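[worker-b] picked up task from shared queue
[worker-b] task type: protein-ligand structure
[worker-b] ligand name resolved to zinc ion; SMILES cross-checked against name lookup, match
[worker-b] sequence length check passed
[worker-b] input payload:
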Amino acid sequence: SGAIYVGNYRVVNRHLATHNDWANLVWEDSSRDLLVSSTTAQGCDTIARCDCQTGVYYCSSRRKHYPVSFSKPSLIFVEASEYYPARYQSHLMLAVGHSEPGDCGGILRCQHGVVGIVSTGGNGLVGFADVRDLLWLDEE
Ligand SMILES: CSC[C@@H]1C[C@@H]1C(=O)N1CCC[C@H](C(N)=O)C1
Ligand SMILES: [Zn+2]
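[worker-b] inference finished, payload out:
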């Protein structure tokens, strides 16, 4: 579990969004596993606006932050699960690391700010849904 809080926005994995998120919806994209809802109070996370390929992510299943190298956001095949059929997920970045069910929502950060959140796992890999292209998160 986990979310990004920027301005009056809450960014969460679409497959983990609560009833309250759907009742206060801003934007969602199933192909990216992202959902953004509106918040009453201002958030303080800064979104990275960069092309960094090294950062640090939080892994709840180990209670540890790990330094990782990760790929550029790409269309990657993700195996069928209880939340989606087998499909290509867009804007996804992979790293070698631990990720189990329960780790989605962990933040990946570089020197510029938040890069994205854990969205996939297994086979000794961890996948992060990028948010650096969502420039509107910084305004209105
Ligand atoms: C971090 S949960 C890891 C277990 C292996 C499972 C995994 O990768 N997915 C299950 C949850 C939905 C994900 C998606 N974004 O399509 C895919
Ligand atoms: Zn960066």
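[worker-b] attaching auto-annotations
[worker-b] Strands lie at 4-13, 25-29, 34-44, 54-59, 64-69, 74-78, 87-96, 107-110, 113-120, 125-130.
[worker-b] releasing lock
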